[PDB]
PDB file of all heavy atoms in Angstrom:
ATOM      1  N   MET A   1     245.458 109.287 216.296  1.00  0.00           N
ATOM      2  CA  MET A   1     246.060 108.844 215.064  1.00  0.00           C
ATOM      3  C   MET A   1     245.144 108.957 213.870  1.00  0.00           C
ATOM      4  O   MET A   1     245.618 108.811 212.751  1.00  0.00           O
ATOM      5  CB  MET A   1     246.505 107.415 215.211  1.00  0.00           C
ATOM      6  CG  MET A   1     247.627 107.288 216.159  1.00  0.00           C
ATOM      7  SD  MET A   1     247.961 105.614 216.616  1.00  0.00           S
ATOM      8  CE  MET A   1     248.885 105.113 215.207  1.00  0.00           C
ATOM      9  N   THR A   2     243.865 109.211 214.056  1.00  0.00           N
ATOM     10  CA  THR A   2     242.967 109.207 212.913  1.00  0.00           C
ATOM     11  C   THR A   2     242.056 110.411 212.875  1.00  0.00           C
ATOM     12  O   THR A   2     240.953 110.316 212.364  1.00  0.00           O
ATOM     13  CB  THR A   2     242.104 107.964 212.907  1.00  0.00           C
ATOM     14  OG1 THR A   2     241.250 108.022 214.033  1.00  0.00           O
ATOM     15  CG2 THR A   2     242.914 106.793 213.037  1.00  0.00           C
ATOM     16  N   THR A   3     242.468 111.547 213.390  1.00  0.00           N
ATOM     17  CA  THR A   3     241.580 112.683 213.286  1.00  0.00           C
ATOM     18  C   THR A   3     241.836 113.526 212.077  1.00  0.00           C
ATOM     19  O   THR A   3     241.133 114.506 211.885  1.00  0.00           O
ATOM     20  CB  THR A   3     241.684 113.598 214.474  1.00  0.00           C
ATOM     21  OG1 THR A   3     243.052 113.880 214.722  1.00  0.00           O
ATOM     22  CG2 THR A   3     241.079 112.968 215.627  1.00  0.00           C
ATOM     23  N   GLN A   4     242.838 113.227 211.297  1.00  0.00           N
ATOM     24  CA  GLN A   4     242.978 113.906 210.037  1.00  0.00           C
ATOM     25  C   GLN A   4     242.393 113.121 208.899  1.00  0.00           C
ATOM     26  O   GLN A   4     242.570 113.509 207.751  1.00  0.00           O
ATOM     27  CB  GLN A   4     244.427 114.144 209.719  1.00  0.00           C
ATOM     28  CG  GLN A   4     245.295 114.086 210.874  1.00  0.00           C
ATOM     29  CD  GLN A   4     245.379 115.395 211.519  1.00  0.00           C
ATOM     30  OE1 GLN A   4     244.393 116.108 211.603  1.00  0.00           O
ATOM     31  NE2 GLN A   4     246.564 115.756 211.966  1.00  0.00           N
ATOM     32  N   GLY A   5     241.794 111.992 209.171  1.00  0.00           N
ATOM     33  CA  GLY A   5     241.438 111.125 208.088  1.00  0.00           C
ATOM     34  C   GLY A   5     242.718 110.452 207.724  1.00  0.00           C
ATOM     35  O   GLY A   5     243.717 111.125 207.511  1.00  0.00           O
ATOM     36  N   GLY A   6     242.737 109.156 207.636  1.00  0.00           N
ATOM     37  CA  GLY A   6     244.011 108.561 207.325  1.00  0.00           C
ATOM     38  C   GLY A   6     244.959 108.508 208.495  1.00  0.00           C
ATOM     39  O   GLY A   6     245.020 109.421 209.309  1.00  0.00           O
ATOM     40  N   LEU A   7     245.727 107.437 208.548  1.00  0.00           N
ATOM     41  CA  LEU A   7     246.538 107.132 209.703  1.00  0.00           C
ATOM     42  C   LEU A   7     247.745 108.025 209.762  1.00  0.00           C
ATOM     43  O   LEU A   7     248.423 108.243 208.765  1.00  0.00           O
ATOM     44  CB  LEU A   7     246.977 105.693 209.646  1.00  0.00           C
ATOM     45  CG  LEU A   7     245.766 104.873 209.276  1.00  0.00           C
ATOM     46  CD1 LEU A   7     246.143 103.472 209.034  1.00  0.00           C
ATOM     47  CD2 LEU A   7     244.798 104.924 210.389  1.00  0.00           C
ATOM     48  N   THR A   8     248.014 108.528 210.950  1.00  0.00           N
ATOM     49  CA  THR A   8     249.156 109.373 211.225  1.00  0.00           C
ATOM     50  C   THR A   8     250.067 108.623 212.168  1.00  0.00           C
ATOM     51  O   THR A   8     249.651 108.262 213.266  1.00  0.00           O
ATOM     52  CB  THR A   8     248.709 110.661 211.872  1.00  0.00           C
ATOM     53  OG1 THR A   8     247.638 111.216 211.117  1.00  0.00           O
ATOM     54  CG2 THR A   8     249.820 111.611 211.893  1.00  0.00           C
ATOM     55  N   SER A   9     251.301 108.407 211.770  1.00  0.00           N
ATOM     56  CA  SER A   9     252.171 107.670 212.653  1.00  0.00           C
ATOM     57  C   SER A   9     252.587 108.528 213.820  1.00  0.00           C
ATOM     58  O   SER A   9     252.588 109.750 213.751  1.00  0.00           O
ATOM     59  CB  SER A   9     253.415 107.232 211.936  1.00  0.00           C
ATOM     60  OG  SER A   9     254.054 108.375 211.436  1.00  0.00           O
ATOM     61  N   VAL A  10     252.968 107.865 214.903  1.00  0.00           N
ATOM     62  CA  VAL A  10     253.515 108.551 216.068  1.00  0.00           C
ATOM     63  C   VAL A  10     255.018 108.588 215.857  1.00  0.00           C
ATOM     64  O   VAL A  10     255.782 107.808 216.413  1.00  0.00           O
ATOM     65  CB  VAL A  10     253.135 107.845 217.353  1.00  0.00           C
ATOM     66  CG1 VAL A  10     253.686 108.561 218.501  1.00  0.00           C
ATOM     67  CG2 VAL A  10     251.670 107.767 217.445  1.00  0.00           C
ATOM     68  N   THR A  11     255.453 109.518 215.018  1.00  0.00           N
ATOM     69  CA  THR A  11     256.855 109.659 214.663  1.00  0.00           C
ATOM     70  C   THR A  11     257.088 111.095 214.261  1.00  0.00           C
ATOM     71  O   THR A  11     256.162 111.903 214.216  1.00  0.00           O
ATOM     72  CB  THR A  11     257.303 108.790 213.485  1.00  0.00           C
ATOM     73  OG1 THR A  11     256.956 109.454 212.273  1.00  0.00           O
ATOM     74  CG2 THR A  11     256.685 107.442 213.476  1.00  0.00           C
ATOM     75  N   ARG A  12     258.337 111.395 213.929  1.00  0.00           N
ATOM     76  CA  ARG A  12     258.669 112.704 213.388  1.00  0.00           C
ATOM     77  C   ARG A  12     257.771 113.061 212.226  1.00  0.00           C
ATOM     78  O   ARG A  12     257.295 114.192 212.122  1.00  0.00           O
ATOM     79  CB  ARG A  12     260.115 112.712 212.932  1.00  0.00           C
ATOM     80  CG  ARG A  12     260.433 111.579 211.996  1.00  0.00           C
ATOM     81  CD  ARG A  12     261.796 111.070 212.278  1.00  0.00           C
ATOM     82  NE  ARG A  12     262.754 112.160 212.300  1.00  0.00           N
ATOM     83  CZ  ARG A  12     263.939 112.079 212.885  1.00  0.00           C
ATOM     84  NH1 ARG A  12     264.298 110.967 213.505  1.00  0.00           N
ATOM     85  NH2 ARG A  12     264.761 113.112 212.859  1.00  0.00           N
ATOM     86  N   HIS A  13     257.530 112.110 211.338  1.00  0.00           N
ATOM     87  CA  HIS A  13     256.752 112.418 210.157  1.00  0.00           C
ATOM     88  C   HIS A  13     255.299 112.641 210.493  1.00  0.00           C
ATOM     89  O   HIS A  13     254.672 113.550 209.954  1.00  0.00           O
ATOM     90  CB  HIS A  13     256.892 111.296 209.158  1.00  0.00           C
ATOM     91  CG  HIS A  13     258.259 111.202 208.578  1.00  0.00           C
ATOM     92  ND1 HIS A  13     258.978 112.315 208.212  1.00  0.00           N
ATOM     93  CD2 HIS A  13     259.044 110.136 208.301  1.00  0.00           C
ATOM     94  CE1 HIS A  13     260.144 111.939 207.727  1.00  0.00           C
ATOM     95  NE2 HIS A  13     260.210 110.622 207.768  1.00  0.00           N
ATOM     96  N   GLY A  14     254.748 111.840 211.376  1.00  0.00           N
ATOM     97  CA  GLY A  14     253.329 111.933 211.577  1.00  0.00           C
ATOM     98  C   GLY A  14     252.868 113.182 212.277  1.00  0.00           C
ATOM     99  O   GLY A  14     252.321 114.076 211.640  1.00  0.00           O
ATOM    100  N   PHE A  15     253.118 113.294 213.565  1.00  0.00           N
ATOM    101  CA  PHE A  15     252.513 114.405 214.272  1.00  0.00           C
ATOM    102  C   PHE A  15     253.374 115.644 214.220  1.00  0.00           C
ATOM    103  O   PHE A  15     252.851 116.751 214.079  1.00  0.00           O
ATOM    104  CB  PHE A  15     252.219 114.014 215.719  1.00  0.00           C
ATOM    105  CG  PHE A  15     253.433 113.854 216.570  1.00  0.00           C
ATOM    106  CD1 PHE A  15     253.987 114.936 217.212  1.00  0.00           C
ATOM    107  CD2 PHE A  15     254.003 112.620 216.753  1.00  0.00           C
ATOM    108  CE1 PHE A  15     255.095 114.794 217.986  1.00  0.00           C
ATOM    109  CE2 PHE A  15     255.115 112.479 217.543  1.00  0.00           C
ATOM    110  CZ  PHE A  15     255.651 113.561 218.161  1.00  0.00           C
ATOM    111  N   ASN A  16     254.685 115.482 214.281  1.00  0.00           N
ATOM    112  CA  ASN A  16     255.560 116.634 214.216  1.00  0.00           C
ATOM    113  C   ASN A  16     255.479 117.362 212.892  1.00  0.00           C
ATOM    114  O   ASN A  16     256.185 118.353 212.702  1.00  0.00           O
ATOM    115  CB  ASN A  16     256.988 116.211 214.477  1.00  0.00           C
ATOM    116  CG  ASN A  16     257.458 116.669 215.799  1.00  0.00           C
ATOM    117  OD1 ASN A  16     256.654 117.006 216.651  1.00  0.00           O
ATOM    118  ND2 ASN A  16     258.764 116.720 215.982  1.00  0.00           N
ATOM    119  N   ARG A  17     254.664 116.892 211.969  1.00  0.00           N
ATOM    120  CA  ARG A  17     254.424 117.612 210.740  1.00  0.00           C
ATOM    121  C   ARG A  17     253.051 118.249 210.709  1.00  0.00           C
ATOM    122  O   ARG A  17     252.666 118.810 209.684  1.00  0.00           O
ATOM    123  CB  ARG A  17     254.603 116.679 209.556  1.00  0.00           C
ATOM    124  CG  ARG A  17     256.020 116.213 209.382  1.00  0.00           C
ATOM    125  CD  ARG A  17     256.624 116.837 208.149  1.00  0.00           C
ATOM    126  NE  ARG A  17     257.647 116.003 207.533  1.00  0.00           N
ATOM    127  CZ  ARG A  17     258.878 115.875 208.005  1.00  0.00           C
ATOM    128  NH1 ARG A  17     259.233 116.514 209.108  1.00  0.00           N
ATOM    129  NH2 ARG A  17     259.754 115.104 207.380  1.00  0.00           N
ATOM    130  N   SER A  18     252.297 118.176 211.796  1.00  0.00           N
ATOM    131  CA  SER A  18     251.124 119.016 211.882  1.00  0.00           C
ATOM    132  C   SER A  18     251.567 120.444 212.124  1.00  0.00           C
ATOM    133  O   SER A  18     252.751 120.759 212.151  1.00  0.00           O
ATOM    134  CB  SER A  18     250.196 118.542 212.988  1.00  0.00           C
ATOM    135  OG  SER A  18     250.851 118.565 214.230  1.00  0.00           O
ATOM    136  N   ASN A  19     250.605 121.331 212.252  1.00  0.00           N
ATOM    137  CA  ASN A  19     250.895 122.717 212.569  1.00  0.00           C
ATOM    138  C   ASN A  19     250.547 123.005 214.025  1.00  0.00           C
ATOM    139  O   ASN A  19     249.564 123.664 214.325  1.00  0.00           O
ATOM    140  CB  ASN A  19     250.106 123.602 211.647  1.00  0.00           C
ATOM    141  CG  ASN A  19     248.714 123.109 211.505  1.00  0.00           C
ATOM    142  OD1 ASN A  19     248.309 122.191 212.209  1.00  0.00           O
ATOM    143  ND2 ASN A  19     247.966 123.689 210.590  1.00  0.00           N
ATOM    144  N   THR A  20     251.378 122.529 214.939  1.00  0.00           N
ATOM    145  CA  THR A  20     251.086 122.675 216.356  1.00  0.00           C
ATOM    146  C   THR A  20     252.148 123.476 217.065  1.00  0.00           C
ATOM    147  O   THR A  20     252.539 123.160 218.176  1.00  0.00           O
ATOM    148  CB  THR A  20     250.935 121.329 217.034  1.00  0.00           C
ATOM    149  OG1 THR A  20     252.129 120.575 216.829  1.00  0.00           O
ATOM    150  CG2 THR A  20     249.764 120.599 216.460  1.00  0.00           C
ATOM    151  N   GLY A  21     252.636 124.517 216.435  1.00  0.00           N
ATOM    152  CA  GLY A  21     253.510 125.414 217.145  1.00  0.00           C
ATOM    153  C   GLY A  21     254.925 124.909 217.157  1.00  0.00           C
ATOM    154  O   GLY A  21     255.195 123.832 217.668  1.00  0.00           O
ATOM    155  N   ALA A  22     255.850 125.716 216.658  1.00  0.00           N
ATOM    156  CA  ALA A  22     257.193 125.229 216.440  1.00  0.00           C
ATOM    157  C   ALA A  22     257.866 124.872 217.745  1.00  0.00           C
ATOM    158  O   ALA A  22     258.555 123.858 217.837  1.00  0.00           O
ATOM    159  CB  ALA A  22     257.990 126.271 215.686  1.00  0.00           C
ATOM    160  N   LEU A  23     257.682 125.686 218.768  1.00  0.00           N
ATOM    161  CA  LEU A  23     258.293 125.365 220.034  1.00  0.00           C
ATOM    162  C   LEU A  23     257.789 124.055 220.589  1.00  0.00           C
ATOM    163  O   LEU A  23     258.459 123.454 221.417  1.00  0.00           O
ATOM    164  CB  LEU A  23     258.040 126.475 221.017  1.00  0.00           C
ATOM    165  CG  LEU A  23     258.737 127.761 220.683  1.00  0.00           C
ATOM    166  CD1 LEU A  23     258.408 128.743 221.744  1.00  0.00           C
ATOM    167  CD2 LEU A  23     260.180 127.476 220.664  1.00  0.00           C
ATOM    168  N   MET A  24     256.652 123.567 220.140  1.00  0.00           N
ATOM    169  CA  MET A  24     256.312 122.225 220.570  1.00  0.00           C
ATOM    170  C   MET A  24     256.914 121.185 219.656  1.00  0.00           C
ATOM    171  O   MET A  24     257.478 120.204 220.122  1.00  0.00           O
ATOM    172  CB  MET A  24     254.812 122.046 220.621  1.00  0.00           C
ATOM    173  CG  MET A  24     254.439 120.639 220.932  1.00  0.00           C
ATOM    174  SD  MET A  24     252.675 120.401 220.859  1.00  0.00           S
ATOM    175  CE  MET A  24     252.155 121.949 221.552  1.00  0.00           C
TER     176      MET A  24
END
């Protein structure tokens, strides 16, 4: 939750908005 600096929620907004491959 904190490797981007700043808190990332475990939700659609948080991680699913990283760039980790669309099929994932």
Side-chain angles (χ1 to χ4, degrees):
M1 292 168 80
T2 66
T3 49
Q4 340 273 38
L7 315 173
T8 311
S9 58
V10 181
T11 82
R12 53 218 309 160
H13 292 319
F15 70 87
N16 252 18
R17 294 250 209 283
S18 60
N19 44 8
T20 57
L23 292 181
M24 174 185 322

